């Protein structure tokens, strides 16, 4: 036994399971928003060596020998990633071992703040992440919410923007120490200086969680959260197209010197370190880092702005086509790479939308929108652009997709009327041979439809 | 745009820093205890599609769609987890979507313990992991020490082995809710039965997290934690030469004045503090590895490899002691060794640092009596990555015999220096010191890249 | 040496400043809303051998021995205190063992509330008592702010009203296990119909603290708070002219019983009465409880009520009186014991007129009101009707105290036009002849004014 | 109206209750340790007019106005209570506000400590108090122990004294930062320079919480806690013979690689966590209360006071013992004394209830050995209240004798009964055993009518 033996080799059953998963990328349009194919640059650092190497610490401040190579790939991942955010190294540092999006968050508030100290992010129904301190009337669901005190701020049902008023009267009663400016459902671009000045008022951190809107931001295709926030975090997947991983950026150099003269430095640098290591994380995925350093640099490339910008062309185009054949849009349409469509409208739910979809290989997920009336059956999708995108999609492709959504959406209006409870509304679709084999059609002519273009990464898995 | 180049076409810098460290390890004598060469079928799988699919749930209640594949792949993963530690899946459950060891924890402690509840592991200077709620005397550590309250338990430096009867003294009266069993640096076996007869006095859960035996446990070549935790977590690299991710393993069934059978309630207080409370979308392709390497752990040639680990260590053992260095508790039960180097005149950190140079990677590690702040004067040496190099007993005293040669190099240096920085300037400047380091440094790579090295052949 | 020995023969020193502190409250006009004069009946039971008894525990679940007196006298102060404010005994329990009104609320807390549970109160300057959760944006100061989170509610400052729709607003989204309905500084009455709906909504406990109000409760010349709470604690003394000690009101009984028949009940008691021992308090101050359940009985009688009714009339009588004299009040008036003016539409604050005052032998607090614009010199008083009440003062009587106040609210108004910052106005009433001697001229007129009223309690001390 | 009625002619079925204890604590043998006897001239200003006066703030810093002769009280209150323990206001401050002991001791933890810090005290089964952190196996009692951490220690059962030994051994894992030197039952002297070694190591505030032995420690018959603590609570009455307040003593001047003298920051918390944090306004009538009693501490009647609680706790020991009775730690060095009646045959909780139907009022107490949960089988009993009757030796002697009478009496009622309710119960229907009682009560209350009471006459 030497473990050089190949996958398909000494692990068939393993082997089938991966390839079947390529297959099943492959002849379905992925529409989630946080989805994205990887570039096989990037797998193949992914699944490499670096999964071997021990290198607790940071560079020059490790705590075993033997670093000496992944020294140098974590410092051009940290030199790639403040290139890639067009980020000055005197203004900017940032942390490359968070192993995903939810632990790099968790890293920033247990560096910045003390158990129980408190915290505001945009609701999750209302289109915020778990990790900015989802809690429910019954339950503290994420660990931010038991760990620290989070109160939601919320959007605006009359416009489905963000109610910054709102958010800046109870900031003002609440006196939060940090407000997150992210999210994971959210259509239009956040006033990323109206979240600074709330913060500067009430002396908080602003936090920007750029984890859905990373590429765009690295394209310089929207504007970017830098200019404004104190901390930033991202997810190293979904816009970006890398593996999965985390960053933390962090101001450093100086704050601010009324009458002192010697300035009062930014003191970020030593508490996010310190936290990710030794604090929460124990040793860093090298594979990951190195993995997510060669989709840093795809992302300074002139090919990467031109991929984001047909990802705005390509949510606008899905925007309009949806508009134009009877759905509805919270906030009206998009300004990045999502749509949050609202099909109250149209007399389905997110719900038995999402279930008619994945049974004709189209992936979508349910989201709350503001005009609701329950959470088992939400009233709209959330779809994502970046996923076809990277498989040369283009606006006609994607108007394409839409036709194929609402034939969907209408089986399941059909299903709906003769059904009741979503129980067997589902069940209806697994047995009536009707509904059936219409579906296998529809399935049939968008796995042809998919198949066509090109795929990232491997040919095979 | 294809996305789908090579690495070497695409970023040749990143590839050429693939192979530097590709070869770091193929010319390097790897006795960092807790580092393994993970096996190439593992890596396909870890750099793999599964890094797109956002499957955020569990196999049938996943909270999107698509997640047809890698609910098979994440069932195939537990079925194999339960398998490779003879587990019954009526008494035993597992969640395979830990990042690592160190989220593994964490979830624990998250799903059974509210803040500040009361945490109690070995010290990390006598051989606890941080995430056994490491506290400093200055400063809270670990974020287990941040969000629950630790007190640690210590060695018995007399003999090395953990007291456990100041802990049944100490436990009585912290009155911890968690006690965790488990382990980073240390040479024997765990008396886990002494453990839940603890835990059992003071009603508290007994934690065996096993990151750096779960190999020995799997291949069944030392006792299982299972027959006597109720929690086990553990990593699922070191020594089962997995991908880097995290397995916490957890008790289905039964926990019986009415004859009401009281039940167990880990598995959906567990599977909720991974997701939704602490973790996000799972790494299918992390998952995915540690299924091949789960595989690779049922066979006989896993076995074969951990009773290899188990000879080799007790080979550099027995070749340390003829050279006359003390080992903490007098050896090793298990796969590594833990030399005390402060009769022989050197510190650990200088022999760390010399080490290095020569390709022979070690940490120091503190050796019961010294305190934490006082430089270490000891070493951990492991068995497994070399060993799963094909490794035997006559090379390990070979490479007890390169240790020599470093630390006897270290012991010269020491007599010509004071301070540790003079010391660590010395090994670089100095012309004839330098020069005998890059002699031993050469018939250390000569006698490592011979042997065969897991994974691919260029990175 | 017995013990025996007169207070006057073996302490002379001690003697003296009794005196003297009995000479200044005869001679001056105490109009703080929460100071009263005790009755001697309870005086004589406060100072008392049951001072002497340690008596841990409760009746019949006492842990020492030798109680049997102090048991009848508990529960008797639990009958008089049930009584007083008209409770089913069936439906109240009372813990009648706190040591001031701060520790009763604090009981409060911890009996029903986890360390960093949510708590929603009036803010302290806004009309709401420390030990409602008040924290300031650089300190938390009350204990119920570091021990619990709270969150203040606020004022409308167009009415001088609780904001009970902001409240409302601002509770969905903080999610708060209790609400405090209770007031230091609020001259109107609460809408503790308006405070159950917000509790009822967000799942929350309603606490009321009828400190301030306690004895115009008792007394049915306002709505009783215990038509509509979980909760009511109270300060023994101030209206209800008692001791010092605290009193806390839980409902028991029956709280629900939708299919299960089987009545779910109410579970405050036992809570309510660990918390306050044995986990925050040692032994009971019998000779308080027995000095409360003198004024208890004293609040059952028809004495009592025409008492409250006087003081309602005195504080529209003060509320008159100032309106119709220049001064503006903040809700525009009065609808309990006290009035909360508004000293900004004089050209003065509460801080340099509470000083000013006090110098004339007339004992007030500056207040913070809606409009003001700082905090070390706030724009208001706050003068309470209950103190010179229980000296037979009637309507008249009031007016022309308001004919003394404005009188030294001139005169700092001339010496404010003299000075700039506020310690050389205080210096001023100190060193200018002219002030000093017409400083002086007020004083002398006021006490005379004041001596000719009786007073409760002893004759010397 | 005119409030001033007296209490016989407003309210006759109050002032028939005042009379009732009065009789009560006149006829009784009154052997709770904690209690005391307050005098007449402490009373009259406790029962004064400064009831009314609310003086929330501090002499020179209240937020109303009116305070002009309350600030000379508090202020006369601070300076005799550093006169009565020979206490130098350069190095120590006191807060006079406390309402009882309970909040003296939160408003230590308050103003020193954040939420859920570790606070260690005597166990409360071991004679440590409540507000030391006291924590049952199943259930957080104290609030100490739900808003800060608590570990205890514990008395060394072999000899019945604190084991300062395990308390540091103890205290360097649990790492608390503060450690309270206090006992509520424990009959010999604390060691606080030992504790302040140990304090010292693990850079913890050393808390004396000297409730109990202020009085002793005013009288300078046993050390003071002043000479090693860093923070000194005491209630105003027990051993202080005062009006129930509380009493915060704190160190003010210096706490000395720079030459800077680092100063002591106690003053600005502890008033602080006094007020606004914990409490309201003051209650002045206390504060004046226990301030005729501070002037009468440094009299040489208080000396003499303490010098015979002392002599009579002894008496009482050597009695004891005389009789066949055993004493934890086998004796007293201050004001009360541990009985163990397990040797005898009879348990506290037996022994408490026939002592209190026949008027003399003790409180059991658990003794080293038998845990909380079990029938305590010993009684604590105290000197200080029957002392301030102008008891001396041959006194106590007979107060001993009614003990064993009525020990004797509750042993045969054991011998004649199976639980404990069986037991209570006999004691009020068995005729024969109730006219036993009747009779020794009859001999009790005569025997303690004749002594002086301090106080009024009749109420
Ligand atoms: N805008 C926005 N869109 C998306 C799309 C995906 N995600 C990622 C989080 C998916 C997620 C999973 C579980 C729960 C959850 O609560 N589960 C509990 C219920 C128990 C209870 O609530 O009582 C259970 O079923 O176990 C949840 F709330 C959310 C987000 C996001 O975070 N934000
Ligand atoms: N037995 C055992 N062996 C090993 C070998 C590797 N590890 C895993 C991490 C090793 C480790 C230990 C301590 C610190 C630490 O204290 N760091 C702070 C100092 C802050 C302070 O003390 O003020 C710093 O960054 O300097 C650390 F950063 C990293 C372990 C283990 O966990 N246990
Ligand atoms: N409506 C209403 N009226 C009244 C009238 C009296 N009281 C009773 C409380 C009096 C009070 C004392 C101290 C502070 C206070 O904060 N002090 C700190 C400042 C440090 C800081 O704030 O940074 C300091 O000077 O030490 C305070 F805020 C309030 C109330 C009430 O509670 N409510
Ligand atoms: N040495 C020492 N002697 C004395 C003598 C008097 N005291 C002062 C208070 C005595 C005390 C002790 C325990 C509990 C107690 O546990 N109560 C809970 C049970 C809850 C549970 O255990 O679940 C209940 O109400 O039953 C208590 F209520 C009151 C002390 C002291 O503090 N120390
Ligand atoms: C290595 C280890 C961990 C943490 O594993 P990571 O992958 O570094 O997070 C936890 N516990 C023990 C005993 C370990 O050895
Ligand atoms: C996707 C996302 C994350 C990261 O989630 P992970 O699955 O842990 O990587 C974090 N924040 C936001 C706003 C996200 O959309
Ligand atoms: C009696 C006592 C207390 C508390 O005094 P209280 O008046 O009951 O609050 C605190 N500590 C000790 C050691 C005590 O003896
Ligand atoms: C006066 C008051 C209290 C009690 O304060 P204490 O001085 O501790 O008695 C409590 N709540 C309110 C609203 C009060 O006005």
């Known amino acids: ?45 992914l699944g490499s060596c670096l999964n071997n190497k021990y290198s607790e610490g940071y560079p020059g401040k490790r705590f075993y020998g033997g670093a000496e190579v992944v020294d140098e790939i974590e410092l051009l991942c940290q030199r790639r990633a403040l290139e890639a955010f067009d980020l000055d190294p005197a203004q900017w540092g940032v942390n490359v071992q968070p192993y995903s999006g939810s632990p790099a968050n968790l890293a920033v508030y247990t560096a910045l703040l003390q158990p129980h100290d408190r915290i505001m992010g945009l609701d999750l129904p209302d289109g915020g992440h778990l990790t900015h301190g989802y809690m429910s009337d019954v339950k503290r669901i994420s660990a931010t919410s038991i760990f620290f005190e989070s109160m939601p701020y919320k959007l605006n049902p009359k416009t489905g923007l963000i109610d910054y008023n709102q958010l800046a009267l109870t900031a003002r009663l609440f006196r939060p120490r940090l407000i997150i400016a992210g999210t994971s459902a959210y259509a239009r671009l956040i006033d990323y200086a109206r979240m600074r000045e709330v913060c500067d008022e009430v002396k908080a951190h602003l936090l920007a969680d750029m984890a859905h809107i990373s590429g765009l931001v690295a394209a310089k295709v929207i504007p970017s959260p830098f200019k404004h926030a104190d901390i930033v975090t991202t997810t190293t997947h979904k816009t970006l197209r890398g593996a999965r991983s985390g960053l933390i950026f962090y101001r450093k150099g100086v704050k601010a010197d009324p009458k002192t003269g010697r300035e009062i430095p930014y003191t970020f640098e030593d508490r996010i370190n310190f936290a990710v290591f030794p604090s929460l994380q124990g040793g860093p995925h090298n594979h990951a880092i190195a993995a997510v350093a060669v989709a840093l640099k795809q992302a300074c490339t002139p090919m990467f702005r031109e991929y984001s910008l047909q990802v705005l062309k390509n949510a606008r185009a899905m925007a309009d086509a949806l508009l134009e054949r009877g759905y509805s849009l919270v906030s009206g349409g998009t300004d990045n790479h999502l749509v949050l469509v609202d099909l109250r ?19 979508a997920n349910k989201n709350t929108c503001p005009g609701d009336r329950s ?13 076809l995108t990277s498989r040369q999609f283009r606006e006609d492709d994607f108007r394409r997709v839409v036709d194929f959504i609402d034939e969907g959406v209408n089986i399941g209006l059909e299903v709906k009327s003769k059904t009741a409870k979503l129980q067997d509304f589902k069940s209806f679709l697994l047995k009536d041979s009707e509904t059936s084999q219409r579906l296998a059609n529809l399935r049939q002519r968008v796995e042809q439809f998919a198949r066509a273009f090109p795929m990232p990464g491997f040919d095979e898995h």
Do not use: H, Y
């Open 375 to 387: 959470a088992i059956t939400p009233g709209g999708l959330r779809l994502g652009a970046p996923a």
């Open 1 to 45: 036994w030497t473990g050089q033996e190949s996958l398909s080799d000494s692990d068939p059953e393993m082997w089938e399971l991966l390839q079947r998963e390529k297959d099943r990328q492959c002849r379905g349009l992925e529409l989630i928003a946080s989805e994205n194919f990887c570039s096989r640059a990037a797998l193949e650092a």
């Open 345 to 363: 409208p149209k007399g389905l739910d997110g719900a038995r939308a999402e279930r008619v979809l994945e049974l004709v290989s189209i992936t």
